[PDB]
Amino acid sequence: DSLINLKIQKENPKVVNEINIEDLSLTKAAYCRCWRSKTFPACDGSHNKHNELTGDNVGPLILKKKEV
Amino acid sequence: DSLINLKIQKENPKVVNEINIEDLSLTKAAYCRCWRSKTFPACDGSHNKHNELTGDNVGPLILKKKE
Ligand code: FES
Ligand code: FES
8 A cells, every 4th residue: 555656746635647648749759657757757778777766667658649 | 666567467577569550440448557457458448346456546548549
């Protein structure tokens, strides 16, 4: 029964982020599911240190947008 | 120093899920960031029980199509 989010918007009772698909410009964009990214909601690779430290296996959600 | 993901795909060293945006069927789709959903990588509202149990404030990432 451990907290998952330690640092992000603790004054907020539920941190929910929205992505409007039409705004995604990159063919590939990674979003954080570990709550350790310094650019949250984006993934910055911080999951890797978390995984090494705790022995976890978390990773990001990758949103893929085909080239029109 | 504690685990975030307790039970999802433990045989996999790093769980990464790819979403093909062009194939979203719903205008609003919620994706799990708590690692408790029974429909992972989709959010099924399991974050609410996690938050109540632990006092946390995690919630989903929501993808929205153009209006
Ligand atoms: S930094 Fe959190 S999933 Fe990559
Ligand atoms: S069930 Fe995990 S964020 Fe909703």
